[PDB]
């Protein structure tokens, strides 16, 4: 049951020496060699530490490592902290005919505070209704932070069943966008007065009203 | 603190926040290479280990 | 310079059989250790397998014990990996790992890898709905355009407009999970309202497991 | 200068104007007892000896 314990978010500092600690539990990690692996997010992994004391060719000497036996932990120290360091680190050991890998330690951080949310409605057309189907989609975008609640209001009573909402996604505008889908039937579409999809943000509430008359 | 001239005796505290010297060439008391600021700040997270 | 290619993935199957291959060049394949390693998308690293330079000794983790097999040859410088009885946990990206002296030196060799995902519950015919907002005012997110994809399974779907002629202003919303575990998404493009009748808009939907390509005209109501 | 931490080697000059430390307890870098300013101004007069 050999396993290596290390954090998940450390070294969040600009331009000074910091250390990361990986420790073992079932046995002494100083008996065998331990290595540190540096992987590009979304690309092929690489290695910063092999032999527990030396370096690959081309790797800068800013990184440094050390081993202590009182704590049964492995220490990797980073000195330069330049703009190249955006990666997550792992510690890998070897107990008996098997390899164990660390959990992972993400290291990433080395104009308008309020954005008006643009909200759009797409009522079903004649093509949707002739196939015994009705999709009412409630779209929201350009909000900050992405903590919003989407609700649907009928003529006289809010609905609970048939409404699905997805998590906001990161777009290319330094903002977030979310979508909500509602499945409905045509008999209640023509038996109501006005349809509303309301969204709530920090001290803000935008409501829209549409009518079945087209 | 991260750097010091030597080890610290028991029951001794230090308040000086000078520039720690690592190399032989002095850095003239400004931020640069081979000399840094030994005092360092902690980063704390609510959802950490 | 050590060169590696991996191409064994690209399809989904529940509990079937799959073959992944890693080809290596620029060194001697009959003298150094070899290994296979995978990682889950968004999760950490974990070890899968290793093999001796002549293929005499092979080992696995206890999670994949009983199944799995690995073999090698030195004539054509390639690694063979065969799997059977897959599960939903097997969605991972696999890298062929190359050793130096043994299991103590380190991995130190990581391929680009191949995206391997699995899926179940077969597939169903997607529904396309190119909504046409003929009457809509200005100062909105979308001037006049609409396409909706619903009742499709599984991910993903390649959505194209006018056979890829236009690519500016195309925004595709992510898929949403419904009460029945069904995906649905929509894509919107900002186009002027004066080109509703003078420009023809085609919303293209392609699904790989369902092998369906449906091209539909957009006509205002 | 009237104080230094130790003796000065030949052909060595010092520009730093820190707070002199004479006793064991630190004075936290402020003027007070058991610590003073090692640099001093000088007084001239025309009718001296």
From Swiss-Prot, chains B, D:
Changing residue 37 to S: In strain: Lambda/C.37, Omicron/BQ.1.1, Omicron/XBB.1.5, Omicron/EG.5.1. Residues 2-37 are annotated as: Disordered. Changing residue 37 to L: Increased resistance to neutralizing antibodies and human covalescent sera neutralization. It comes from the Viruses. Changing residue 40 to Y: Reduced host ACE2-binding affinity in vitro. Changing residue 7 to K: In strain: Omicron/BA.2.75, Omicron/BQ.1.1, Omicron/XBB.1.5, Omicron/EG.5.1. Changing residue 24 to N: In strain: 20A.EU2, Iota/B.1.526, Omicron/BA.1, Omicron/BA.2, Omicron/BA.2.12.1, Omicron/BA.2.75, Omicron/BA.4, Omicron/BA.5, Omicron/BQ.1.1, Omicron/XBB.1.5, Omicron/EG.5.1. Changing residue 40 to R: In strain: Omicron/BA.1, Omicron/BA.2, Omicron/BA.2.12.1. Residues 1-49 are annotated as: Receptor-binding motif. Disulfide bonds join 27-35. Changing residue 33 to V: In strain: Omicron/BA.4, Omicron/BA.5, Omicron/BQ.1.1. Binds to host ACE2. RBD also interacts with the N-linked glycan on 'Asn-90' of ACE2. Cleavage of S generates a polybasic C-terminal sequence on S1 that binds to host Neuropilin-1 (NRP1) and Neuropilin-2 (NRP2) receptors. Interacts with host integrin alpha-5/beta-1 (ITGA5:ITGB1) and with ACE2 in complex with integrin alpha-5/beta-1 (ITGA5:ITGB1). May interact via cytoplasmic c-terminus with M protein. May interact (via N-terminus) with host bilirubin and biliverdin, thereby preventing antibody binding to the SARS-CoV-2 spike NTD via an allosteric mechanism. Attaches the virion to the cell membrane by interacting with host receptor, initiating the infection. The major receptor is host ACE2. When S2/S2' has been cleaved, binding to the receptor triggers direct fusion at the cell membrane. When S2/S2' has not been cleaved, binding to the receptor results in internalization of the virus by endocytosis using host TFRC and GRM2 and leading to fusion of the virion membrane with the host endosomal membrane. Alternatively, may use NRP1/NRP2 and integrin as entry receptors. This is Spike protein S1. It comes from Severe acute respiratory syndrome coronavirus 2 (2019-nCoV). The chain holds residues 454 to 502 of 1273 of the full protein.
